[PDB]
Design a protein around this ligand. Sequence first.
Ligand SMILES: [Mg+2]
Ligand SMILES: [Zn+2]
Ligand SMILES: [Zn+2]
Ligand SMILES: [Zn+2]
Lengths: 112, 140, 140, 266, 559, 46, 155, 69, 244, 115, 86, 49
Amino acid sequence: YDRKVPSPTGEYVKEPEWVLETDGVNLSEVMTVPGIDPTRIYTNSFIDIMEVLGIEAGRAALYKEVYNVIASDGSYVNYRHMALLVDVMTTQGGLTSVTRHGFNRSNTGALM
Amino acid sequence: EGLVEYIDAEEEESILIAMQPEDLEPAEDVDPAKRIRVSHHATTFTHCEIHPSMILGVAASIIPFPDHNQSPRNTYQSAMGKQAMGVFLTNYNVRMDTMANILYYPQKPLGTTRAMEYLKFRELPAGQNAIVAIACYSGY
Amino acid sequence: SNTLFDDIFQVSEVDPGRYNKVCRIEAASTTQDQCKLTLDINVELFPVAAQDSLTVTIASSLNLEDTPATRSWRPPQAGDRSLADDYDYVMYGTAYKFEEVSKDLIAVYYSFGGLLMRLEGNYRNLNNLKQENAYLLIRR
Amino acid sequence: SEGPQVKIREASKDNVDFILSNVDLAMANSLRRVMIAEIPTLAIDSVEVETNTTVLADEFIAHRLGLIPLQSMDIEQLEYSRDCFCEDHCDKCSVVLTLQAFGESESTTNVYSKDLVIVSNLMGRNIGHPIIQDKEGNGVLICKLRKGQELKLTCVAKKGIAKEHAKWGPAAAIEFEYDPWNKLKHTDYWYEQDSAKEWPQSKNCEYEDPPNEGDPFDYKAQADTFYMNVESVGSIPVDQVVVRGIDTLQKKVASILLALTQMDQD
Amino acid sequence: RGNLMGKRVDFSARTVISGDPNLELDQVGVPKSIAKTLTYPEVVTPYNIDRLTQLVRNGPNEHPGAKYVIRDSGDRIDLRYSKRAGDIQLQYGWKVERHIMDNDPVLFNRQPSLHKMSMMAHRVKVIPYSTFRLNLSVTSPYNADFDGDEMNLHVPQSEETRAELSQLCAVPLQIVSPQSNKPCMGIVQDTLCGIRKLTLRDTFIELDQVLNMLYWVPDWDGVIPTPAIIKPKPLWSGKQILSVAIPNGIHLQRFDEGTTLLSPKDNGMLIIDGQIIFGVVEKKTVGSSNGGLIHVVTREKGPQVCAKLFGNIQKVVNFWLLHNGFSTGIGDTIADGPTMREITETIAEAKKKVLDVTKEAQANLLTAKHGMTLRESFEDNVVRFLNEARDKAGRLAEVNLKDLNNVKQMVMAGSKGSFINIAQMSACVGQQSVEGKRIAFGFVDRTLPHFSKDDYSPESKGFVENSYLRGLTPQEFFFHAMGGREGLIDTAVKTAETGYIQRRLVKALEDIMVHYDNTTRNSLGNVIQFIYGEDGMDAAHIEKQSLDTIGGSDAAFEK
Amino acid sequence: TLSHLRRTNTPIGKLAKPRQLHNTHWGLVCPAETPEGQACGLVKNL
Amino acid sequence: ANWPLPVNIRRIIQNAQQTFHIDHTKPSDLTIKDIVLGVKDLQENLLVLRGKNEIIQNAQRDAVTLFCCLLRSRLATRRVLQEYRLTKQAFDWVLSNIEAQFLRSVVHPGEMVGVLAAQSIGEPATQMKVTSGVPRLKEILNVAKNMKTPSLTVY
Amino acid sequence: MIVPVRCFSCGKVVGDKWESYLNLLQEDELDEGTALSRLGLKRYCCRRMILTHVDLIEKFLRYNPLEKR
Amino acid sequence: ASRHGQKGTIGITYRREDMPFTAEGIVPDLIINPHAIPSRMTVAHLIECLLSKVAALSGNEGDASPFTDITVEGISKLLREHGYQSRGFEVMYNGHTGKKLMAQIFFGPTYYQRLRHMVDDKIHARARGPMQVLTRQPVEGRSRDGGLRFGEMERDCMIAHGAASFLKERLMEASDAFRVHICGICGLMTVIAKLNHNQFECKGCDNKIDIYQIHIPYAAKLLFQELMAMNITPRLYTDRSRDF
Amino acid sequence: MNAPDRFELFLLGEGESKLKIDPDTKAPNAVVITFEKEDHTLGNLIRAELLNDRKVLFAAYKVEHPFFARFKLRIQTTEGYDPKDALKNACNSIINKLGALKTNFETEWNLQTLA
Amino acid sequence: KEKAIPKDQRATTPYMTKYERARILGTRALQISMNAPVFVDLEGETDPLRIAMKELAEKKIPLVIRRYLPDGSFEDWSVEELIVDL
Amino acid sequence: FDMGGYFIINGSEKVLIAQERSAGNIVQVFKKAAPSPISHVAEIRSALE
Ligand SMILES: [Mg+2]
Ligand SMILES: [Zn+2]
Ligand SMILES: [Zn+2]
Ligand SMILES: [Zn+2]
């Protein structure tokens, strides 16, 4: 992959780095393997991110997953629209689904 | 006489069919406008298609040059060809139907299809030959 | 009113580009070795060929006596006298940029309704060109 | 007299071909618009059906009858039904035609426009008679009948213009062309390799000299010397179509002048 | 869901919609019969006592007219059957239910109505015929065409809703969408193609035509601009006349690839004081794009000024295109002989490359790419070669197209089409894929009963070598039909699945609102965000800007 | 009328994708005649 | 460096230059003290929250952090005097417009952002190695324990 | 169902040429192209009016009359 | 619609003297936008027009069967033999002014079809009309003077616009609106109101001075009554019991 | 059905005038004339004739909507020249030119033999 | 009245919102349509909405907006003192 | 031109749409998903006409 890191002169230059892509997720055990950068490891499934790094880390991971889907087709959506959806999904100290088993099990009035 | 044979989908799995007798059957400059046709250089043909155009149905046999169209457009025409006013029957004056539509002056197409002969479209046409201009005239 | 710039140029080359009526001509002044002109000319009304000599003049107004959307343009009337009578090709446009090329070289950009002109010269010959509207007169 | 010039190339009872020179494009275009849409003509407008045992609908026959071209040489002597002081219609603003056909023969019998009979008082006029323009002497095939079928109806003809309905249109296609050599650069010829070889030359190209093949474009030239071919449907003579087209356009301009004068007083 | 959340309502109308380039952006054409059915209860006041009395006299069968008279006591008097006693004497405080007139604000909607711009308020314009009429520029927000689509109309019945509808839902207020902080309305179709043609350097307009074009702009100042060319013939450039529609004081600058101050290709854009200096006008300028002319105008001069811009540009551009013309035919999809010879060789070279790989795999001398099987690696190589063959073939055809080619003209202006459309119509349809893979062996080890088993050549697994101009062979026709069926199935399935997703999302966030303390809370009062969007701004007012401090080298920063 | 007299219907728990135009359909059912709605692919024409 | 931000400063600067017809050659009358203090006190008027307590004031300061960075970068002492050639009258005009434009961009209380956000995310969905498109969006919205193609990225 | 009275495009009368057209095809042994030109139909708008017309009236006339006099 | 998926409605009708005309005097019976061709790639539509033009000029029946040896170039050659542009382009004149159109128009015959959808069978409006017996809302169906559905999605868009008052007007004044009396003790709609005598009573609570009237949709009344028959007590109250 | 009666294209209605002349405030000595029950046939002809007059500075016409048969004509003349007088001269020129054409056509037609 | 914030410590935005303007114009327009006394000089106008717009421009609308907080507290803002900047 | 092929029931023309079904008396082997004790199943819908 190509990542833009600051150059010693002060400019941003693209340098190549070797990145490993995996099928299957074991975040807890892989994160401890020596030789990798634990401060940058990312997982496709935001569920394991929440269980290992916390709700706030899951919040960022959830937004990135949503952003990728929206940006996969080239469409652009304002950040706050996705941020609000992600914030609602993580406001109850956890990842609440948008089905009848998630937001519809709260206490917001029977009529709603 | 053994000149033609009925073949089902299961039996097609064990035969080799030729698109047309013109080129594939005979043992084997070229016009730049003709489509690129593959000979397939096969010398074991067991059957020959009556005509490739017969793979189409009743509704798809009315389209002129359907092979010069994007596939989804042909599908739309098939559905729309069934909603076109015409002459469903010649005895519309003695039948009491819930609803019936009859065109005043039906005309047969200027560009027709050979399969169209057996659908009686030249006897019961649904449409007219209008003079059409493709232009941006008034923005309407 | 009064001429802001006048000189005689020799057309180095003519480029029709992708257009059929407008050509971009590169010319250099015959008296100054640091003056060049890039101009777009409607060759349908004023054909231009290579190695041709053109007298280029820029004026702020067309009326003879000095008078230093201003006013609604009206068709010329019989007996009207103006600087345009002494030239063959006349254009009206606006200056939209003043660029410094070197210590003493100044380039002025003009746009006559989409036909762009670039006048490059020393600081002491293009000092009368202001960021305003001006007429361009060309005589063969 | 030293105004627009006219030169007739081919004259017939159905088509007139001429060159209209020393005229402006606006006038030439307006003339053809008036010839198509604003020349009064006589046509069947209402039909009363007494008996109809045919295989066609009553409105189907009525529509066909309205498209039958009728003589309109003396149309100016007729009056508009809207401008006449009559209950429904009279001999001063209308013509009545009757059609009666019965299937007396075993074979199919054809009903033509020659079977229409005028039952009104023409008062010495020259209008109403259906136009017969074929060798056999029959007219338009209005309907077909078999044995035992009868058609009985009455037609009323009124004067109108094509703007109200196309059936009062007295002129067929009108050819109109100018500058066959494209010397005014009014068209950008679409082509693949060479426009001249791909675009056939108009038949009018022989009446004008070709371009000098290298001369500068003439920006002072204005379109003139229009080539026109007016066709007539047969209701009125083709020459009368052009003559009355000019008359109609002249009257319309005069009406504007008259209206302007009336405003001047007030 | 069927009777409380959504229910059928009165005072509404439905009919087919049509396009009218002579209608303002916010105007809607209403059929006369519909206007005679829908009514608005207007209160009788000293200001309209005379006007309302005339409507009562006109009766309910003559537009403009009235249908009912409601007294202050609540009694309703039907105008029909009432004329026998003569016209009613009106009094202050009464209500006269009269036909909807011109300029009456109405709500115009089209289902499924997936976003707020699909339901906007328009101004009534009673018209002949039995169809609704609306401006072309507002079709994109509605996602509507004129192939038979129908739209719903709703008439407010109170002054409060009348003012609320016209001050929040008005079309001009929806020009800049908050979904992507970019305009959702722009010049489209004929006006987009015409404006691109009109702004070319070769477009010059004579005096007679210029006067007509100038007069077509309602807000024209009555001053004829000086022609770009004064002698030997007064000619106005296309940019000069179009600049009249652009309001004064608008500045816009854009540089495309290779664009300089002396634009050699006439690309880019430069507008000073509402005058176009150089550059062609296309979708990047007058379309629904970020930073375009519409975005600049609506943010600098307001929404009402921007609404007038839509009409002015359309009126001037449509008139010019009416007298200029623009068409397209078979001749626009035909490439010259040399291009076809190059295209045929290009495809043959790709086939030969595919032949070589198909021979190495048969010899087992091909090593599978890491992470993929031998067969999967072979398929990827074949697909890559064939996909590139179509792209290269299309490039040759597109380059050969002349500037006069109508299909090329449409693509350049952005009105319709794209590169792939030109390539498939003229050069090569390409490889047909089902389930993201080549045509599978429906039969035993073959695709159709015309090839021998284990045939992996492009012609066998669904490579359409011909173009739509040349025609598809029967094998290609069936393979192409198979690919299209995948698209039709996806369209049906995608619509159903996506509709459920949208409903779920809306219901989960329907009770979230921004409060007067700038915090985002739901119906329970729980705080979702302590400030909307983490910055407190509105998406409709956001624009993309460059941060000059983050970028650049240290030396550049110091300088 | 002719099309309606030659139509076929496929009642849709199954593990397959019957809506696709299978290769064996060549020459037996029209590859282009199918409804555009919920019945796409399931209703075929001979 | 290209990010969405409320006020388009570049357009405002251009309007000031074109409105007052900046000479671009004659020296300006601006002073270094005026520019630095003019920009500094402008940042104080960019009020999103109006509480008079420490917690709200800190939140207000944080809310305009990024915008102030853009404001300072564009209205730099060197850039204003050297690149823009702004006059004191022009500079004051720019400052007033920036304050007015920023206050117009603030979200209006009572706006139903929740429905707007849902429609802005759902409307694009109708037009839509790893799972993408609607199946992935369904995978995200529906919190499914087992996803089709889980993956890890290791640096 | 029956030959139109007028050409749709230009309004030329074509309803009085149907029998002549049929006669030319049958007795004169002329192809449809030559017969159309001999009838004076030059513009292709008129040619398609007679060339593509279907005479459904003949089929209807085969049914016995509903009401005989 | 044509035989190639191209369908559309009549935008406007023009008389003969307004339509563009060729040098021969032929005016189109129909005008379609060029923009429909590229995105849809219905090349057969263009070929058919070229073939149909040749067929009419030659008095023949065009052969448009899918898989034949007929090529576009062959049609073009025959068309050129007739004195027409090989690609079907013609020089046209503007009907308003008579001036030549700068561009040449693809012009020829094509077979078009009239579909069953006519606007007169769809146009309909409703100010007021019959209501359903059960829900007391506008009936369904054009033939029965029914109303139009203001569905939940439409409600969502109005909530986004912030037009709270308009939303109430659609749901109450433009649809079912019912006034009911509720008891101050029990929130049930079981108050017997003798409006002629100006008397109210809530049997079971034994009160006549604690009655309130509320405006709710008739459907809402039906829901609560249905719930009451289901042993559920939806109680409507006018005063708050808990602070926000 | 909402199809207007076809006679509304040319027939003048009740309480309606053929011409409606109103002064234009956008430019000096400019007037706008509204023609009722007229189309491009007269607007194009009148506008073209006006442009031939050296004392007319601006002359243009437009049809706001094709549904209605009315067009607007804007005329601006030099100071001291009445726009109404300019219209008078233009109409008279058209009438005179048309009359000359009619006579020329008739004399040429009388010289033919086939018809 | 502990739910009424005194004018000295109001912390809401001093700018009238689009929703506040929409209701104020609609409410005042409705009152005008029902024969309410007009407090602004009329230079010729019959539309109640237009008259309301004229009143708002001159700040002659005798109404106050009671902005509610998510806890039940509220602030009273007069139309005259609210700046109309949008 | 009428081709028949339909029934007249209560005055209404009714057409019997052909119904597509899987052939009987044919052995078909299918694979099941991982969450199942059975990996492969051979099923025959025995039918006697
Ligand atoms: Mg549609
Ligand atoms: Zn009479
Ligand atoms: Zn014709
Ligand atoms: Zn009680």
